Amino acid sequence: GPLGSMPEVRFQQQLEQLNSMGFINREANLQALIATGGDINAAIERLLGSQLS
Numbered sequence: 842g843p844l845g846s847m848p849e850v851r852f853q854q855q856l857e858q859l860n861s862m863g864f865i866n867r868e869a870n871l872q873a874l875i876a877t878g879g880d881i882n883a884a885i886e887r888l889l890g891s892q893l894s
Contacts (some may be wrong), residue, residue: 855881
């Protein structure tokens with residue numbers, strides 16, 4: 842049984858992908874992936890869209 846309870850197996854790879862996009866705030870990257878569950882598209886759109894400063 843492949844364990845999906847190993848989030849970085851999805852997250853960290855998408856994190857390299859965001860890493861390619863100039864997103865190296867691992868925290869932000871995978872937090873975006875936390876609320877998207879591996880939806881890196883929305884992950885990016887959360888980094889671009891949800892920047893509450």
